[PDB]
Amino acid sequence: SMQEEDTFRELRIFLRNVTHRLAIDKRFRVFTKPVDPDEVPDYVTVIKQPMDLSSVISKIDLHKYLTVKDYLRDIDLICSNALEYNPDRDPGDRLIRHRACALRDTAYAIIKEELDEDFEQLCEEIQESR
């Protein structure tokens, strides 16, 4: 329906705004663009599902997220990819893990404070009904 389309449009607007807020945070700059396969030729071979905030924006715009849950699965990937690719005790790896996982945590915290659970519930019900 029209109303269902309106619902998904509001979802997109909400997700773009959350994503923008993460993207403008200085700590998160390394996650704003895909890893360049110049600097990092092994990345694309170790990490099977690369994810970054610019890809998140593309996916929003292509209508790939129909619920906040599906968006958070991609946010989770940003964290878990960093944990997996940068597991070492050295400070360079520790800083990327800290920042990737602070991204996760910040996205969760914004959503906990600002997403209405009945709005999420509606998105899930429309998605399921397809």
Ligand X SMILES: CNC(=O)[C@H](CCCCNC(C)=O)NC(C)=O
Query: Residue 75 Cβ, how far from ligand X at the closest point, in Å?
Result: 14
Which of residues 3, 45, 92, 117 is near ligand X by CB under 6 A? 92
Cα-based distances in Å from 63 to 16, 24, 58, 87: 12, 23, 9, 33
The least distance separating ligand X from the CB of residue 59, rounded to whole angstroms, comes to 18
Range 123-126, long-range pairs (CB < 8 A, 24+ positions): 123/7, 123/8, 123/11, 123/66, 123/67, 123/68, 124/67, 124/69, 126/4, 126/7, 126/8, 126/66
Binding track over 10-49 against ligand X, x by CB under 6 A? --------------------x----x---xx-x-------
CB of 84 to ligand X, least distance (A): 9
Q: Which is nearer to ligand X, 74 or 123 (CB)?
A: 74
Site for ligand X in 71-90 (CB under 6 A): 82, 85-86
Point out which residues bind ligand X (CB under 6 A).
30, 35, 39-40, 42, 82, 85-86, 92, 96
